[PDB]
Amino acid sequence: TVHDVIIIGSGPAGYTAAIYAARAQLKPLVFEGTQFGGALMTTTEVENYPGFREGITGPELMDQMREQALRFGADLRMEDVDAVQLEGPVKTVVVGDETHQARAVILAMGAAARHLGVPGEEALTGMGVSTCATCDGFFFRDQDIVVVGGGDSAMEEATFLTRFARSVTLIHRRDEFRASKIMLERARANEKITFLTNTEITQIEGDPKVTGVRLRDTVTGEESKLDVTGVFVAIGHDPRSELVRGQVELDDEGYVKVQGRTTYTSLDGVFAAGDLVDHTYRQAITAAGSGCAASIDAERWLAEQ
Amino acid sequence: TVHDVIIIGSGPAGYTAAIYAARAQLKPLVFEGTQFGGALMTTTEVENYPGFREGITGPELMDQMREQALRFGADLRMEDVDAVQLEGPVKTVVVGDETHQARAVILAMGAAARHLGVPGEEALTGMGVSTCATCDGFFFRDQDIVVVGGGDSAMEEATFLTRFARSVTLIHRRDEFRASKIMLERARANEKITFLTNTEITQIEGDPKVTGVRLRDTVTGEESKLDVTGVFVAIGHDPRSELVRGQVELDDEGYVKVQGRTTYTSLDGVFAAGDLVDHTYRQAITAAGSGCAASIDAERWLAEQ
Ligand SMILES: Cc1cc2nc3c(=O)[nH]c(=O)nc-3n(C[C@H](O)[C@H](O)[C@H](O)COP(=O)(O)OP(=O)(O)OC[C@H]3O[C@@H](n4cnc5c(N)ncnc54)[C@H](O)[C@@H]3O)c2cc1C
Ligand SMILES: Cc1cc2nc3c(=O)[nH]c(=O)nc-3n(C[C@H](O)[C@H](O)[C@H](O)COP(=O)(O)OP(=O)(O)OC[C@H]3O[C@@H](n4cnc5c(N)ncnc54)[C@H](O)[C@@H]3O)c2cc1C
Ligand SMILES: Nc1nsc2ncccc12
Ligand SMILES: Nc1nsc2ncccc12
Ligand SMILES: [Mg+2]
Ligand SMILES: [Mg+2]
Ligand SMILES: [Mg+2]
Ligand SMILES: [Mg+2]
């Protein structure tokens, strides 16, 4: 059995690709992963996804898309793909001890936000801990918050957040910032931002919501506590391209390269969408858009065979 | 009064840009047009927009996005922009006898589908007449339908539609097809497709829904009637770039050019999204995605000033 299309991933990109491929009668086979639903599964209210005047929670939205894919005939499997063979007319995915094959594959594995790895981080996510100033900065009006990271992203997150927060404490493990000079001088100039170099978070305190962070100096080991009600983590993202490394061309940061404004990868019959590709916008609505394009690309490519 | 951002257009691209710009506290000023709401205002059920397991009508979806923009503080005006001055630090739009100025402008005027211009076409839209095989081909399972056009798009629409329709009659005013050779031989090969060259539609019949088309030979004037229950119009699209011609760089077909995978135009502080730019995918979800990107681009650019 060789399917027309296999989709790997179950965030907005993968489910939108599945909706379009199923409605196009391609009977898509979708491997959602055991941690299915993408990054919105791990948040609370999603307010900037167009179409919901009153907002919708992450899991509610993601279950709408999943049922929508099912309604049109997508075959959804809550299983991880463990290995892929993507070269040639027939592509293979390996799921545990099972194999499945298709003529086209849409890569929609997304990107992981890098975590601090400290107690409280996971429990308090969507409850004071966030990775996305565009998404949640709204909710921290007149509050004291922290941003963690030393790059352009953390610089941009911290400066953006000062239009809501009472104050922004920018925390970084070293005393060198890898951010660009222009980005660095911007938040230096911002009066609502204070830098803490050579500082790490060791724990996030929070009754139901974030109440404080425990800090440690990476040089002296001196510890203290900071009272804050938000923690924005901006220490980078890792595209989930491990499956395809050595098969599809990646950029220096591991994102899947695509041709022009399309979803075509370096391999014939292989298409990529969502935050696996995009290191610029990283929103549900942009990932959904690109999942639609991947399905249209794949359909047109299949027609040319 | 110089606003941070003015948005021109009220389809998915413009309303998604407004949601993001308003939530980012940029107080966007949006000129929706008198025919506001974009192309989905003119359709019935929208089933492939991810997030609605049971579908939603075009006007329902578009009113959700409009109220969503309002909720976050966008200033919406149901007025047409009649002229623009986009060069320089302060951009001007002219609306009748009124002027409004901004530091950044997001162009979201969309693309018009070219119409046959015959009686019944407008009344029967969403009721048997469509411009989008991806959108509505589903609903014509086992029916006899027509596709109008002589280019690659009509070729692609006709071949795609044969996975639903009982038969597809492809109609074109001339006996030369401007479509590529490969596209032309594909539907020639398709057994469900019959060509009618030198033929135009003069009228679409339809009690509540399409029941037939009246035809005329463009050489002899011979007329006849064809019993069909769908009419797919695929005679091209016209991007609504008239406002900006001579100011922003356009491609040979009038689409606004953008840099790389961003929404940046050839003019500083001017960004473009939706079907004004995209001649490839042309879906609500892709237009919404690109409207999000335009607002993120604009915000980042405004921060650099
Ligand atoms: C806490 C948080 C809050 C956010 N809030 C918002 C918000 O309010 N608005 C907004 O627009 N954006 C928000 N985002 C961002 C948005 O969720 C992402 O940009 C978007 O989900 C990207 O979708 P994607 O499909 O590319 O990938 P992902 O969402 O990462 O989804 C990919 C999915 O595929 C699965 N997968 C990966 N590898 C495999 C494999 N080998 N086999 C099987 N399955 C696999 C993953 O487990 C995951 O479930 C938020 C992100 C986070 C982390
Ligand atoms: C009949 C039909 C059915 C469709 N069905 C579907 C479907 O089921 N699913 C799907 O995904 N896609 C569908 N589409 C396609 C989808 O609607 C478009 O791809 C999408 O709306 C593009 O959005 P846009 O914002 O770029 O432009 P548009 O939707 O064209 O919106 C632009 C808006 O801006 C306004 N505007 C333009 N110029 C000015 C000006 N100078 N001043 C003020 N306002 C101005 C216009 O009047 C219009 O209201 C359909 C299209 C049609 C025609
Ligand atoms: N726990 C942390 N505080 S700062 C930082 N930077 C990278 C990784 C972890 C941490
Ligand atoms: N009414 C028509 N039938 S075919 C065609 N082609 C272009 C414009 C109109 C028409
Ligand atoms: Mg995983
Ligand atoms: Mg996840
Ligand atoms: Mg108009
Ligand atoms: Mg319209």
Q: How many CB atoms lie within 10 A of CB B2?
A: 12
Q: CB–CB of A7/A65 below 8 Å?
A: no
Cα(A297) to centroid(ligand 1), Å? 21
Residue A98 contacts by C-beta under 8 Å, 6 or more apart in sequence?
A: none
**Looking at the structure, do residues B229 and B120 belong to the same domain, yes or no?**
yes
The residue behind tokens 């055991």 is A34
**Does one domain contain both B5 and B107?**
yes
Domain CATH code at residue A30: 3.50.50.60
What's the order of all strands across the beta sheet hosting A129-130? A129-130, A230-233, A144-148, A167-171, A193-196
Chain B within 8 Å of A285 (Cβ-Cβ)? yes
Number of domains in chain B: 2
- Report chain A's C-alpha Rg in angstroms: 21
Resolution in A: 1.9
Q: Do A60 and A131 fall into the same domain?
A: no
B190 close contact with A: CB closer than 8 A: no
Which of the listed residues B188, B215, B236 is the one where a domain comes to its end?
Answer: B236
Distance separating alpha carbons of residues B199 and B219, to the nearest angstrom: 8
Helix/strand/coil (H/E/C) assignment for every residue in chain B: CEEEEEEECCCHHHHHHHHHHHHCCCCCEEECCCCCCCHHHHCCEECCCCCCCCCEEHHHHHHHHHHHHHHCCCEEECCCCCEEECCCCCEEEEECCEEEEEEEEEECCCEEECCCCCCCCCCCECCCEECCHHHHHHHHCCCEEEEECCCHHHHHHHHHHCCCCCEEEEECCCCCCCCCHHHHHHHHHCCCEEEECCEEEEEEEECCCEEEEEEEECCCCCEEEEECCEEEECCCEEECCHHHECCECECCCCCECCCCCCCECCCCCEEECHHHCCCCCCCHHHHHHHHHHHHHHHHHHHHCC
Q: How many CB atoms lie within 10 A of CB A290?
A: 33
| Secondary element (H or E) of residue A223 | strand A223-227
d(CA B179, CA B187): 11
End of a domain among A186, A209, A236? A236
Are residues A218 and A253 located together in one domain of the fold? no
H or E element at residue A299: helix A284-303
SS3 A99: strand
**What is the C-alpha to C-alpha distance for residues A144 and B134, in angstroms, rounded to an integer?**
49
Same structural domain, B121 and B225:
yes
B262/A280 CB distance under 8 A: yes
The whole-angstrom distance between A139's CA and the closest CA on chain B is 11
Report which DSSP code applies to A38. Answer: -
Query: Between vectors from CA B141 to CA B138 and to CA B146, what angle results, nearest 5°?
Result: 90
- Chain B CB within 8 Å of residue A300 CB: yes
- Which amino acid is present at B57? T
| 3-state SS assignment for residue A191 | coil
Residues A136 and A179 occupy one common structural domain: yes
Strand partners, A34: none
Closest CA to A23 of B127, B49, B148: B49
Is B290 near chain A, with CB under 8 Å?
Answer: yes
Which residue ranges have their beta carbon within 6 Å of ligand 1?
A 8-14, 31-33, 35-40, 42-43, 46, 48-49, 80-81, 108-111, 113, 125, 130-132, 135, 240, 243, 274-276, 282-285, 287
Specify the residue with its C-alpha closest to ligand 2, atom 12. Answer: B283
Cα–Cα distance list, B244 to A73, B84, B111, B174 (Å): 43, 7, 14, 33
Q: Which of A8, A11, A9 is nearest to A283 (CA)?
A: A11
Report DSSP state, residue A83. E
Q: Would an 8 Å CB–CB cutoff place A68 in contact with chain B?
A: yes
Tokens linked to A75: 């075959």
Tell whether ligand 2 has an atom less than 6 A from the beta carbon of residue B42.
yes
Same domain, A229 and A123: yes
Residues of chain A contacting residue B292, judged by C-beta atoms under 8 Å apart: 48, 50, 281, 283, 285-286
Residues B169, B276 share a domain: no
Q: Distance (Å, rounded) from C-alpha B102 to C-alpha B104?
A: 6
Neighbours of A245 (CB within 10 A): 11
Pairwise CA distance, residues B189 & A170, whole Å: 64
Q: Which residues of B touch A291 (CB under 8 A)?
A: 50
Cα gap A249→B161, rounded to integer Å: 34
A153 with A257, same domain?
Answer: no
Q: How far is A16 from A289, CA to CA, in rounded Å?
A: 8
Closest CA to B116 of B27, B268, B232: B232
Q: Which residues pair with B113 in a beta bridge?
A: B237
Which protein residue has the closest C-alpha to ligand 1 atom 48?
A38
Active site residues of B: 132, 135-136
Amino acid at A136: D
**Which chain B residue has the Cα nearest residue A54?**
B68
For CA atoms B9, A287, A21, B193, the dihedral sign is positive
In this structure, the answer to whether residues B93 and B21 fall within a common structural domain is yes
Q: Are B216 and B222 in contact (CB under 8 A)?
A: yes
Asked if residue A145 and residue A12 are part of one domain, the reply reads no
Tell me which of B236, B271, B288 is where a domain ends.
Answer: B236
Element (H, E) at A142: none
Question: Would you tell me how many other CB atoms lie within 10 Å of the CB of residue A282?
Answer: 21
Which burial class, exposed, middle or buried, applies to A227 when counting CB atoms under 10 A from its CB (0-12, 13-18, 19+)? exposed
Residue B119 has φ and ψ, to the nearest 5°, of -60, 140
> Residue B127: is it exposed, middle or buried by C-beta count within 10 angstroms (0-12/13-18/19+)?
middle
Beta-bridge partner residues of B237 = B113
Query: What domain range is B6 assigned to?
Result: 1-113+237-305
Nearest partner of A269 among A300, A238, A298, A292, judged by Cα: A298
Pocket residues: Cβ below 6 A from ligand 3: A 116, 118, 148, 171, 173, 200-201, 235
Residue with tokens 């995978």: B261
Q: Which residues pair with B195 in a beta bridge?
A: B170
Cα(A111)–Cα(A276) distance, rounded to whole angstroms?
6
Q: Which two tokens stand for residue A41?
A: 């599964």
Instruction: Report yes or no: B239 and B275 within 8 Å, Cβ to Cβ.
Output: yes
Q: For residue B182, list chain A residues with Cβ-Cβ distance below 8 A.
A: 304
* Burial environment of residue B217 by CB neighbours within 10 A (0 to 12, 13 to 18, 19 or more): middle
The residue whose CB lies within 8 Å of the most ligand 2 atoms, and thus the one to mutate among B29, B32, B34, B40, is B40
Residues A127 and A170 in one domain: yes
Tokens (6 digits) for A291:
């999942």
Cα distance between residue A272 and residue A290, in whole Å = 8
For β-strands A56-57 and A144-148, DSSP reports them as unpaired
